[PDB]
Amino acid sequence: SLTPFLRLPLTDLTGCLINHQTYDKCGKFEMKMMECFEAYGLERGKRECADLISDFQECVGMQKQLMRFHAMRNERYKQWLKGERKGQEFFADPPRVDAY
Amino acid sequence: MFNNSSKILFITIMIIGTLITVTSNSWLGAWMGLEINLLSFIPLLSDNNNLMSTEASLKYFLTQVLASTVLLFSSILLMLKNNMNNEINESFTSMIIMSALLLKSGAAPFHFWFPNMMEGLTWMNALMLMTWQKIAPLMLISYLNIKYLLLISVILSVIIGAIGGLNQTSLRKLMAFSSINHLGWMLSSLMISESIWLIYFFFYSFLSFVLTFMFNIFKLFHLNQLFSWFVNSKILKFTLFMNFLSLGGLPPFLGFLPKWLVIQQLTLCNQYFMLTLMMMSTLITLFFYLRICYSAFMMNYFENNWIMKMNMNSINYNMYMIMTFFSIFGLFLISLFYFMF
Amino acid sequence: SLLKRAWNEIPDIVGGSALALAGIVMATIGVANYYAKDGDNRRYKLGYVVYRHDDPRALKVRNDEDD
Amino acid sequence: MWFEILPGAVIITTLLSVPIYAMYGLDKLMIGNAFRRNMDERFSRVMYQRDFRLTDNPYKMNGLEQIPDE
Amino acid sequence: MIQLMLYSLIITTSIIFLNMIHPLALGLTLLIQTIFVCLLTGLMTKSFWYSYILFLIFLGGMLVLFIYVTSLASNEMFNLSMKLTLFSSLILIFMLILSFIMDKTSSSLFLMNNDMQSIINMNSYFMENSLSLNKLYNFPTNFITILLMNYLLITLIVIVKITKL
Amino acid sequence: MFSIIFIALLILLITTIVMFLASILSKKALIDREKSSPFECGFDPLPFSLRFFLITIIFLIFDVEIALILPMIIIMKYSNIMIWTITSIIFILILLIGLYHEWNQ
Amino acid sequence: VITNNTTLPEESELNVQELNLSSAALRAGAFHLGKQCEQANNEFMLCRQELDDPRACLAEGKAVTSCALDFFRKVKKTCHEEFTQYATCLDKSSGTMAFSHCRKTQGVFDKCIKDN
Amino acid sequence: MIMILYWSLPMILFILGLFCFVSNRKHLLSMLLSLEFIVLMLFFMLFIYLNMLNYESYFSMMFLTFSVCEGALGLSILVSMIRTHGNDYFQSFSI
Amino acid sequence: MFYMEFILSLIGSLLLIICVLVSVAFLTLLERKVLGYIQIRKGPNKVGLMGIPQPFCDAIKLFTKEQTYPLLSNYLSYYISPIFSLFLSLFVWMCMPFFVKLYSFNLGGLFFLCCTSLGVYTVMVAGWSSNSNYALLGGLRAVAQTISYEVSLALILLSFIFLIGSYNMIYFFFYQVYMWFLIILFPMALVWVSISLAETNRTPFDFAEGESELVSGFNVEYSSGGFALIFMAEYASILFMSMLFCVIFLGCDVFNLLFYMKLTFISFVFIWVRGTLPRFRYDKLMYLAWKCFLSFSLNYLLFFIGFKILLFSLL
Ligand SMILES: CCCCCCCCCCCCCCCCCC(=O)OC[C@H](COP(=O)([O-])OCC[N+](C)(C)C)OC(=O)CCCCCCCCCCCCCCCCC
């Protein structure tokens, strides 16, 4: 989060407006980043606290999971276009409707 | 500008919106405060007696809402890439954020709205425009760590803001072009400190209050109008015009101090070529300051003789003469100052 | 007087202001009645809420009869 | 005299009574259950999903005869 | 699939918004874009509250000013061209058959709906449009909506001054 | 919502088909100079009004204000009671004071 | 996310006879199910809420499923037609399965349970 | 990648509305209507951002309030020139 | 997902549309008949038997007459107003409280406010495209009154939603199982009648679409099928306001035949105030919509804020 220049009474309302702290899949990850930004500050927290930054961005940004999903779907279509996979076995056994 | 209490209401809400902008810990509450500041700065900069003020408010609206939506779009893009407000390695979305801030502030690739709007205003809304409305974008520019955009903006500000003020004989466009050059000294101070910028901005603001009060009380809008200005003693007109030499950065007066602190901090930060590029392009600013000073440095003029009484406000000129004294004798207070360190 | 003029010209606004004053009074009455008892600890929780006996919240549960 | 309005009004009472009552027949014809399942709360949608998972007709009952003897 | 249909409709209405010049016709293009934007933001969300809020605020509330100003601005009627209608229909049928020949699972949005969430999620079963709107009326974010109502009153005060009445 | 799109497109399609068949069923006569004329009573033939524009602006400000009064029915059983009451009483009271002040001035 | 390092349970451990009842057969007879099966439901949901691990307290989930199956088999032994009529009236009563639309067969079901 | 497949279209239509905002072949009313087009695209992109988080969608009516006040402000700026510049200022291609 | 839900939803919606349209025709018959009986005179008669196929005589005539245009060159904008007007009047009925499920509208009041907020849009394109100063004046007057009581209607229905605790229209049924809301909300009943005669142009609020101060507000150039679609859309709005009065105040009672008897009675009340009251003025209607009804709305909304807080502590 951005460090404001001035710490007046007028940052008290703006500060809580967006935050993963309200119930969320991994706000407990963000807290583990945010307290780290209390420890080293904002600028040393960019270097000394890089492992906890990437987990929160991985969780809520959903980057490598969606990239892995698109790698698994494009490889299946490449195998379909290259003739390795065809017919009724193009798609696997579907999950149950209440599985997830 | 105090014809109504509603304008005092708009002044305090634009102060509130600017303070919401500069204290926001996220990139979206800053945009919220920017919209509050915009809402309260649309009715100021608009009046019924002046025809050009309405189209100048239209230019201000289109320029700011073009800059605010690009600022919002790039901040949402940054939040979509990395979900914290900061960024580990700087990329193009910070460049779009900084360019949207430079359209708000008036840096020289994006400054062409600034004197074209300034050509049709009064001298108090100009005082709000070049001083308080530079608070909200410049305090957000300090959150970014890209160097070459600030380098291009500083270089273009000090050449374009100094050369472009030579042709202008209107005082408002000349002061706008002088504020564009003094903007570039503020962004050059922003790459090296967040306190030397406050020093330069506070005393540049002080010089803006004391110099725009000379043109607001006596209603001066032209270079030729300064020659016809009647002062009862020509020594007083010569003394009152030392604020131009003060703001141009001359050593015995104040106004040499913040430029000198920028020089001291930039040389200590091993940046010598950009400092030389600014100071070879600040002599032109003193040249169109000294072209104003043709109307007072000589001691006798071919005056028009129909006006023989100097008419002035009491409270405003009482506030003016305090600040004129500290604009030229304010270097004695360097021993009392402790905010440089 | 002043209330006679308001009751003569604008009687619906006077009646609405009486209703709004009554609603404000019984809103403060409802807030005081909610916070006089343990209104923050509702009797009927949503979801499936379980507490073990070591938790401090398990000692604050309500054993009242169903109304 | 004045009872000629009731030709023009009671018909209005009949026609607007049509789009529910016919459905109260029609849901008893092709479904067999007179009421379609309410999709307001999420728990009702999840349990309707469970019924359509269990049987191809979600309004077909899985009673106690489904339970094997043990 | 219908998300891709709304993508295609928004693309077609945007390119005809770029093409046309008559101001009430751009206002009509905006009012028919707002419906598709409302539905498409309804596809990502748990429930359709904010689409309704955007609908009442933008279309039925705000754009009627734009429709009134653009109606009194232009004396003349629309010059309907069958060429632009044919080009819009051709690019629309092309983009729908392009969505037919494209896998919709990879093109679907990653944002979870109310039924895309987990079954063991406790918060989804409570009340529709409850936890998202909760922070509007709780400490310490209620000062923003108090400031918003004050901002709307101050906006009306600004508008009365700048139009000069 | 996907069924709502289908039924709204069906209502639009049915109304356009009914109007197209009405245009076919309409009696086509010879088109005239005076028949196409805009109707002014009898003999053949407006500027911008600011009062109606501020009526639309007052409607817009009150509409965006109503859009913040809309959520709090749901939140009343899922929030702090004192905060909710303070915000609701303050919200409608400042609205009433602003309405009465704009009435008196 | 699931890799080869994570230890998912085998499908033979997951091959448990499940409660395959419909919504009307689960909504009806629920108030006698919860009282009879309160020892395992609370422990299993405490396992699900505390650890937040799907692989943990699988034995507790199996105990919940077996306890529900035992209660429904006990209902099937004694009071079958009354429960079938109660679930039928609960499903045909309204759209959502609301208990207030028919209370006539609920009393017969509670009378059967109280007598047996 | 993620940017190419997800949220690429609001960027493209935002640049199209920006180019319609600043083109010299349009007029001031077209600038204001294209401005509310990019307001709609900004709402689309902001809602795509805000729905990665679960229960922070309440911000969508804050940006709506600010941008609707911007639109009413722009209309009241533009129609304030009716009594001064006349009714023909809506067809102005340059400022 | 089970396909008979889609099939029965489609069948029920089309049956609702057909029955609403035939009830619109018989509502025009009822209005011409009992509106005559408001005075001494008789209603329609002598066509068919006892005047029953008189709206079909209207429908055969209006679908045969020459479709004239307000200008000869370009008139496609003239077409799009009755299409969208009848589309909204037949589309607003999907948020009717159906107990057998047709559409699970958990937010039905917002849907009603959306369709009412498009009513201004269809009457604005009705006014502008008809190329006449009378048409523009009537369109501006109708847009003025409908956005003036849009805010009031939103606040009144917003006060009603506080009673049931949610936005689901079927929740009006469970809170009316012991008594109707006509007992508790009788000034709200009079205010809601004044609201429902304002969004739909009827005689008490008729400066928009009257035959005295204008010849016709926005139907002045509309004829030969467009006037038929506009007339059917307006009477469907009357039927929707009668139903929405009968759901909120009178008990929803969707299945009972007494609910549809009360719906015909509230339509009779709408035709009863059609013959009685005179027409308001522009200044008095701006006084009514923004001061009296707005002040009553905010005040009695404060009353239900206090009452719902008071019952929350007691329950
Ligand atoms: C089965 C019923 C059969 C009979 C009825 C049949 C018809 C059905 C109902 C139709 C109703 C009429 C519809 C059209 C109305 C047209 C007239 C109209 O709009 O008039 C507007 C008029 C206008 O007000 P006005 O009359 O003051 O304004 C005109 C006078 N000037 C301009 C000079 C000021 O009335 C109102 O707006 C009244 C406000 C709403 C109603 C009152 C609510 C007040 C709050 C509740 C009571 C408060 C507590 C009181 C007790 C305690 C006091 C301390």
Side-chain angles (χ1 to χ4, degrees), chain A residues 17 19-20 22 24-25 70, chain H residues 6 52-54 56 58-59:
Chain A
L17 177 63
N19 47 19
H20 296 68
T22 268
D24 214 300
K25 13 152 208 331
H70 287 324
Chain H
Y6 311 115
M52 293 183 286
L53 289 87
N54 290 138
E56 316 293 325
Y58 70 101
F59 182 76

Side-chain angles (χ1 to χ4, degrees), chain H residues 22-62:
Chain H
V22 305
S23 67
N24 284 267
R25 295 179 180 90
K26 293 301 213 320
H27 51 89
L28 303 186
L29 272 165
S30 170
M31 293 177 71
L32 261 70
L33 295 151
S34 68
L35 180 59
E36 297 301 328
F37 175 64
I38 81 176
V39 167
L40 277 179
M41 295 298 103
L42 268 182
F43 192 84
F44 192 24
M45 185 180 288
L46 178 72
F47 206 70
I48 296 169
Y49 159 67
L50 283 173
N51 284 47
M52 293 183 286
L53 289 87
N54 290 138
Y55 297 132
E56 316 293 325
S57 296
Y58 70 101
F59 182 76
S60 307
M61 60 198 46
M62 266 165 221

Side-chain angles (χ1 to χ4, degrees), chain F residues 8-22:
Chain F
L9 283 187
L10 258 182
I11 293 168
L12 215 48
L13 164 74
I14 284 299
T15 46
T16 47
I17 282 300
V18 162
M19 172 85 178
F20 178 56
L21 266 70

Side-chain angles (χ1 to χ4, degrees), chain H:
Chain H
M1 65 179 288
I2 313 298
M3 208 188 290
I4 301 299
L5 192 53
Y6 311 115
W7 71 79
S8 83
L9 198 62
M11 311 215 308
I12 301 302
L13 303 169
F14 188 80
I15 298 300
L16 286 190
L18 277 192
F19 266 115
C20 183
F21 187 83
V22 305
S23 67
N24 284 267
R25 295 179 180 90
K26 293 301 213 320
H27 51 89
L28 303 186
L29 272 165
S30 170
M31 293 177 71
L32 261 70
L33 295 151
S34 68
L35 180 59
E36 297 301 328
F37 175 64
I38 81 176
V39 167
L40 277 179
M41 295 298 103
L42 268 182
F43 192 84
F44 192 24
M45 185 180 288
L46 178 72
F47 206 70
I48 296 169
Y49 159 67
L50 283 173
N51 284 47
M52 293 183 286
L53 289 87
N54 290 138
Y55 297 132
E56 316 293 325
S57 296
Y58 70 101
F59 182 76
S60 307
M61 60 198 46
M62 266 165 221
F63 152 78
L64 261 176
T65 302
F66 283 123
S67 295
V68 158
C69 288
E70 285 155 57
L73 203 58
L75 286 171
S76 302
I77 279 176
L78 184 62
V79 308
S80 68
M81 281 155 218
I82 286 299
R83 35 167 293 272
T84 296
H85 291 228
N87 263 267
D88 306 337
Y89 202 61
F90 294 146
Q91 309 188 16
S92 292
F93 270 21
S94 75
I95 306 190

Side-chain angles (χ1 to χ4, degrees), chain B residues 280-335:
Chain B
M280 293 183 286
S281 311
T282 199
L283 309 167
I284 318 166
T285 310
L286 198 52
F287 179 60
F288 58 75
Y289 286 164
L290 272 163
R291 193 173 66 242
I292 304 186
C293 282
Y294 284 165
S295 44
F297 280 178
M298 271 85 78
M299 296 296 172
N300 290 132
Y301 293 98
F302 270 55
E303 301 255 350
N304 281 116
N305 50 0
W306 62 76
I307 171 166
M308 294 182 286
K309 296 179 188 292
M310 154 178 83
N311 283 263
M312 61 165 148
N313 196 359
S314 50
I315 296 101
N316 219 0
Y317 184 109
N318 174 49
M319 293 177 70
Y320 170 51
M321 299 300 283
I322 309 175
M323 294 177 71
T324 310
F325 185 84
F326 298 130
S327 166
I328 62 170
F329 294 108
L331 203 66
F332 279 61
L333 282 72
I334 190 50
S335 61

